[PDB]
Amino acid sequence: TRDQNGTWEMESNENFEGWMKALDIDFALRKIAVRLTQTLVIDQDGDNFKVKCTSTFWNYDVDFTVGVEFDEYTKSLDNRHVKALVTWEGDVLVCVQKGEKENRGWKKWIEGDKLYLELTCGDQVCRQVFKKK
Ligand SMILES: *C/C=C(C)/C=C/C=C(C)/C=C/C1=C(C)CCCC1(C)C
Q1: Which ligand 1 atom is at minimum distance from the Cα of 55?
Q2: H-type alpha helices, 2-126
Q3: Could you tell me the fold of the domain covering 1-133?
Q4: I need a labelling partner for 41 at 20 to 30 A (CA). Which of 55, 99, 114, 131 fits?
Q5: Could you tell me if the CB of 53 is within 6 A of ligand 1?
Q6: What are phi and psi of 32, to 5 degrees?
């Protein structure tokens, strides 16, 4: 399944600090972020996605179209410009964000009732798992 639409609750977060540190997020914000429960809400309609991440203190939202490059400003995350592209490799949704950081992007896939999210930046890999609400 390519179907990622739904509300998803984080169950596992490995190397969450290493990835944020790779992006140079402020130590004070990382210290609090590592404690927070996260929810992902995904609306998928053909190529068009709307992804909302939420936690008590900070959110992150991004819209994109699969297969269409977009010049992204990463906003309150790390205030950088990247050239983002999201495509499918089999049933894995793959985002590459070309820019200052090497190996920057993510991969999103479903295994049964679970959504797996691998976030990358430099030499760091953060692996997350969510269960569908
Ligand atoms: C496709 C799903 C993606 C790309 C999920 C992205 C989620 C984030 C970039 C999360 C950012 C957050 C922090 C770095 C600090 C705490 C609050 C979060 C979870 C919104």
Answers
A1: 17
A2: 16-22, 27-33
A3: Lipocalin (2.40.128)
A4: 99
A5: yes
A6: -85, -40
